[PDB]
Design a protein around this ligand. Structure first.
Ligand SMILES: [Br-]
Ligand SMILES: [Br-]
Ligand SMILES: [Pt+2]
Length: 112
């Protein structure tokens, strides 16, 4: 997964020249004839898109889920990211749509 190619539905909507709510509308109103052309996935409360068809979005997990998997407070990774960002150097992550995301692989790297 290339985390430089990861956007919210609103940002992806602008990236394809449409109003900010275009993909959110397509999702809410089940316009699959539209949705089928995109690489996207529901991840937590965000619909995440990539303009790269090869990005495996199933690798992306919320920092909240990652925190819970480690047996920590929901805000464990969010807290560390805010105050001590160097701790996530070498750890694949992205903050977008006011949400921190890690990957399945980078969670494993973090544990080591
Ligand atoms: Br916090
Ligand atoms: Br905080
Ligand atoms: Pt905090």
């Amino acid at each position: 997964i290339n985390l430089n190619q990861i956007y919210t539905a609103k940002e992806m909507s602008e990236r394809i020249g449409k109003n900010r709510n275009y993909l959110s509308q397509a999702y809410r109103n089940n316009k699959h004839e539209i949705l089928k052309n995109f690489n996207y996935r529901k991840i937590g409360g965000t619909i995440i898109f990539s303009d790269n068809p090869n990005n495996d979005l199933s690798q992306l997990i919320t920092a909240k889920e990652a925190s819970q998997l480690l047996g920590k407070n929901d805000e464990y990774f969010a807290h560390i990211y805010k105050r001590f960002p160097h701790r996530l150097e070498g750890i694949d992550h992205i903050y977008t749509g006011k949400t921190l995301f890690l990957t399945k692989e980078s969670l494993e790297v973090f544990k080591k």
